[PDB]
Amino acid sequence: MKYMITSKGDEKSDLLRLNMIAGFGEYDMEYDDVEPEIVISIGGDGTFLSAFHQYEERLDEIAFIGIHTGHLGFYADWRPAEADKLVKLLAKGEYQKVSYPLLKTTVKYGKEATYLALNESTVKSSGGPFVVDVVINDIHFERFRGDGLCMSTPSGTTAYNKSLGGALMHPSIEAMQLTEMASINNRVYRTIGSPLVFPKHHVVSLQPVNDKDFQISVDHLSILHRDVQEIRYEVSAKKIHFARFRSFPFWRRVHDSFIED
Amino acid sequence: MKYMITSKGDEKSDLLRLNMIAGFGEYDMEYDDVEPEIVISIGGDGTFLSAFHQYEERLDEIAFIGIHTGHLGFYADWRPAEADKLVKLLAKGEYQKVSYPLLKTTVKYGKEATYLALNESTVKSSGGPFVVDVVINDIHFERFRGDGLCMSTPSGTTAYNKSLGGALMHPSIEAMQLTEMASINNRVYRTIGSPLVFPKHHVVSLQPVNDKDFQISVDHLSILHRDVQEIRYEVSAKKIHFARFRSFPFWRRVHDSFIED
Amino acid sequence: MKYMITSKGDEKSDLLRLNMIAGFGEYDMEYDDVEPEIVISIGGDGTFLSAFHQYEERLDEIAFIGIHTGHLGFYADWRPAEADKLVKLLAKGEYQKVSYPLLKTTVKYGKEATYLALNESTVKSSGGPFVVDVVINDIHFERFRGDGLCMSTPSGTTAYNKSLGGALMHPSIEAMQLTEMASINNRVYRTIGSPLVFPKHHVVSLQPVNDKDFQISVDHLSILHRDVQEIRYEVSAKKIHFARFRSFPFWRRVHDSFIED
Amino acid sequence: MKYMITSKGDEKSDLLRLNMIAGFGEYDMEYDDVEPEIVISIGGDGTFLSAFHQYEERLDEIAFIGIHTGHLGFYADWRPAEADKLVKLLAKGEYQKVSYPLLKTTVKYGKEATYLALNESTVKSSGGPFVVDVVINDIHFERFRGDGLCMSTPSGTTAYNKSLGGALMHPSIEAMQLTEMASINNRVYRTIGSPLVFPKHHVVSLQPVNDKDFQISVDHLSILHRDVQEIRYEVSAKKIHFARFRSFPFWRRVHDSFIED
């Protein structure tokens, strides 16, 4: 029905976008970037991430599709050569939807801000040492000293989380994963070390010890937050929906990206 | 109703066992180690593991309880001082049950053997190099060369899995986790490296490349298997049930064991 | 002969400093913080690091001593109770000196700046992605994409380097060690992963790929450098000298700090 | 002068060997596999390792050369196409020698056995738990519980040591590196975790706690030792010598093997 297309903005992606719009013009399809029902991202995973955040207030009404004009992306998992086939199948419709879990981040001050992540949310200090108390379902778990912390969605586990030693999780698992960035461990300072995987309805709370200023990232976006009293992580009730047109299993996607393609 | 008690076999555990039996004699409780409904393990996690495997054919009819006479165990999570309180609460009954997921291992030859794991199942070679093809839901994922592989239950993630870099997973997540033991990675040999977390109904199959003899462990038990054609891992449909009498959250149990107690 | 004493600045360290000065007044010892021959640091390792950098232009004329008024430090390895014994032994003299290797960092622009490190020097980006070409003795070794890189002295290996997975090296080895911070590794991006240990006279050069702005740290000090053409690492020809009065072996120091004391 | 050639034993390596012998027949070169001065290994690193151990009692009289008929090896670093060039340059002589450090392993019982390693020596248990006390220069450093331990030469650091998280060390550094295999770390059990790098004249001693039977490997060779009282590691005074005919820097060799070739 209603659809829009975002572009990475290079020549290859802009022209693929115009060609798909022309191809869409031959069906009962209406270009609408205010209330689209299909969002096509042409570029890479960064382009797809921006498309998700552009429309994160209408996630239940939108099915996303990614086309990678560079190397294979984990979200942009369609090749440009299949664009005409994609146009045809999209126009007809009757496609199945698959849903991936998302991460909710709440930042409290001394007022509240909430953010939704498709990959992950990270916390680092403003410049000095990073020290937070990690509280799991109101239980004090550890005092973390180090570079920072990363809380990843399942589909995010192949991104920053992977570089930090985290496990790769199949996205059908409604969970979030917390990994450490360079923790100090000696006689007096102790962290768990291992990645931690949390189910739905578990709340991980980060509470400042001394400094209350933190650089908080949500996917690409990174903002300095001041006078922070708490950072709360939990699996969101909201999910992102993908239009699926053929089988591209997650573990094959992992294989193609990290082992060989 | 019917109950039995296993002991580590040292003086401390044998006498605690006899005292609980005497205390149980004052209620409508019958000692039966053929068809018990409550299985009390007195000792450590190894003692608890043997109790589980002693009765793994009646898991749906049994609630397990562990008493640790040494350091705190992840399964034997009751102190000996609470034994009298445990007797009293057990006798009355009306206790809630909590269930943890289990791992099913199938070993095929050229005939079939199946095993149930509460912690993990590992595969190593008989002596020479270990090389297996890793197949996920019939998709060839990687050729693994190294010391071996470990497939862990959620409650097993704090055991061997943790020492191999795996993530700690809350046991409410029905999953299994595959970690690598010292993989070779160079130009010609590529593994994923990261731990992999699999949901229910995903089948991980290990298939020999040259040598077909493997040392396979299931919890404590380790057996040399010969003429192996395939090793299949999946989350079991069977679950282990614990009698719960108070709140001892998993993440607090993790905290008490690895951070401080 | 000539000596000075730096203090962490809390009450405990200031008063210990005044007491040692009073005790030194009973010997042929002259307080001189312009050209001291003995530099006593009272506080922690951060205090010792500042003392080293305060006098890094007279390293060949100075023997350093650290007193830890908090937990045991790797550089401040004397307890406050031994201060009177230290005064007496220092005044007499005839102490042996031990030398630790240092790291030289050269930053080139489009002009040159050089820095000396006792712990390590790290490179991170100004905000966006960090991408550098790593060149070893003029040989292009890898293109590094990730959070950053850390080059550690031997005595620094128990500090940031340790938290990044680096090896602990005995300080008698004239070397530097390069560790990765969260590198991306997929089909198209490849780093070595492993820590790299370099002997004297090997030059590791970091060369920008796109962005030329970098946040460069040397021990505690962190500075944003702009218009960087190259960052060069090599083991310095200069060494830091410690006054030794009893045996405190490095591996015992490692044991006391990380295993138990 | 005197020379011999070992072969992997496949058709490619046997015929290359015969062709080099025929080519050597045109110079003042004598085939002697009793007291050779040049040892040519044709095959892979395993073939080279066997050549080293075949002649480990005449290391000071022998210069080794490796030809890799498969993928590039770290010791067999010459291609078969250069065999004729190698024959010519070898016959003339006047080649430079480069030396790599070696590892000495002493096994004491209740009698003594000593072994020389070019890659590494590892210790594992006979079947049950592996527990040893790690003693560094007579100082008790840690009690290690886990799968085992690996002590690597510098040139060995790119082999098993690399798969265990160890650092890659340039072979001009006279050192040995100790890495852990899956150590248990909790409240009651503590190891250092990090790889440890030891200079010449440091002695690392492994002492049994309960079981005295250990599976000890030296390069390819693996032997069950019984009634072990101590395992002692130190950098050997003996070195292996390579004939060098052109520049093939170690870090380029690392690059070609792990990054790209």
Ligand SMILES: NCCCN(CC#Cc1nc2c(N)ncnc2n1[C@@H]1O[C@H](CNC(=O)NCc2ccccc2)[C@@H](O)[C@H]1O)C[C@H]1O[C@@H](n2cnc3c(N)ncnc32)[C@H](O)[C@@H]1O
């Ligand atoms: N260019 C602006 C936006 C950059 N990123 C977009 C992305 C992405 C992504 N998501 C992936 C996924 N779920 N599974 C596997 N692949 C996934 N990709 C892949 O990652 C690559 C791109 N990303 C990248 O170079 N970032 C470095 C960076 C650092 C600082 C600022 C900006 C960029 C590409 O190949 C794509 O295919 C944003 C995402 O970087 C991830 N990120 C951040 N820091 C690191 C790190 N140190 N190591 C690994 N990933 C990191 C993080 O997770 C974030 O959401």
Ligand SMILES: NCCCN(CC#Cc1nc2c(N)ncnc2n1[C@@H]1O[C@H](CNC(=O)NCc2ccccc2)[C@@H](O)[C@H]1O)C[C@H]1O[C@@H](n2cnc3c(N)ncnc32)[C@H](O)[C@@H]1O
């Ligand atoms: N004694 C015969 C039986 C030994 N093990 C019993 C157990 C256990 C256990 N389960 C735990 C859990 N889910 N979460 C946290 N804690 C858990 N425990 C804790 O682990 C300790 C005991 N186990 C141990 O020293 N094993 C070494 C070993 C090697 C070879 C043969 C026999 C023993 C104790 O403190 C207990 O509290 C069996 C279990 O060893 C685990 N295991 C095996 N190898 C390693 C390793 N290299 N690193 C870490 N764990 C290992 C594995 O996972 C197995 O199921």
Ligand SMILES: NCCCN(CC#Cc1nc2c(N)ncnc2n1[C@@H]1O[C@H](CNC(=O)NCc2ccccc2)[C@@H](O)[C@H]1O)C[C@H]1O[C@@H](n2cnc3c(N)ncnc32)[C@H](O)[C@@H]1O
């Ligand atoms: N307070 C201002 C100055 C802080 N640091 C002083 C120091 C130190 C030190 N040197 C040590 C050594 N050679 N071997 C073992 N112990 C050694 N110490 C020990 O490290 C602790 C102190 N340092 C620390 O919390 N820093 C966190 C930090 C981050 C950002 C800004 C400021 C501080 C103390 O216990 C002492 O005993 C400076 C040194 O931090 C090291 N550092 C930096 N980031 C990390 C990290 N993520 N993980 C581990 N170390 C880190 C680095 O290496 C630097 O030179």
Ligand SMILES: NCCCN(CC#Cc1nc2c(N)ncnc2n1[C@@H]1O[C@H](CNC(=O)NCc2ccccc2)[C@@H](O)[C@H]1O)C[C@H]1O[C@@H](n2cnc3c(N)ncnc32)[C@H](O)[C@@H]1O
């Ligand atoms: N085939 C009989 C003999 C096998 N090995 C010969 C070798 C070698 C070698 N030395 C290398 C070096 N210094 N730097 C880089 N490359 C180096 N190679 C490379 O390693 C590959 C070969 N080796 C291998 O598959 N071994 C697995 C194995 C396990 C159990 C029994 C037999 C073999 C090849 O590509 C070659 O190019 C012996 C050496 O295996 C090393 N080894 C042992 N276990 C592991 C492991 N889990 N992970 C990584 N290496 C391991 C160890 O270190 C030993 O000395």
